[PDB]
Design a binder for this molecule. Structure first.
Ligand SMILES: CC(C)CN(C[C@@H](O)[C@H](Cc1ccccc1)NC(=O)[C@@H]1CN(c2cccc(C(F)(F)F)c2)C(=O)O1)S(=O)(=O)c1ccc2c(c1)OCO2
Lengths: 99, 99
């Protein structure tokens, strides 16, 4: 599909038994999801944006479905106000910017 | 052009006769540039991000040429970690997400 940017590019994602709305975000290197208790090993990380840094937990090889498109990769979990699908997963679902 | 997302979508912009690199950022409502001088009246504003809130200066009706495409709109200037082109200008240049 084609998503215009008149409004925030929110789409439905699935991670386990959780459906959530998330931004397709070309400005995000990494995928950052709001606080959730995922299974498995993780490592602590800091990520920076407007206003400074937040502490996140990095989980590897997590499957996520994004508008029915399958993805699997690193997801950062932490105190973000919005679920952010970053470039690591945007590429896996074939997402490009066009103008 | 079509822009893939295996690398950051950084582009050259022209503003006030100056060339800068900026990130095409579909997760950003607003265009926010690092500290710079722009002419004319501005208004103090505060905006939020992943790390908290910052103070910015809001300049209206500023021409920016983004990758050869002309925009005229609101530019916020302040302590963003990198120059970002947000949806307010991405829409002007006809940018969409496609997968
Ligand atoms: C500023 C960019 C260079 C980076 N950000 C991505 C931007 O697209 C963010 C996404 C975002 C959107 C909403 C809340 C928080 C983050 N966008 C922005 O910073 C601004 C913030 N923002 C906003 C608007 C209204 C309210 C608010 C809030 F109240 F939540 F702060 C934020 C908005 O529209 O764009 S980022 O989210 O900070 C980010 C994401 C992934 C990363 C990373 C940094 O480092 C490694 O991996």
């Amino acid at each position: 599909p084609q998503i215009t940017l008149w409004k925030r590019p929110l789409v439905t994602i699935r991670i386990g038994g959780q459906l959530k709305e998330a931004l397709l975000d070309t400005g995000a290197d990494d995928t950052v999801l709001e606080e959730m208790n995922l299974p498995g090993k993780w490592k602590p990380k800091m990520i920076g944006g407007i206003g400074g840094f937040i502490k996140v937990r990095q989980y590897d090889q997590i499957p996520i479905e994004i508008c029915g498109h399958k993805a699997i990769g690193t997801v950062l979990v932490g105190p973000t106000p919005v679920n952010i699908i970053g470039r690591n997963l945007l590429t896996q679902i074939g997402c490009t910017l066009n103008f």
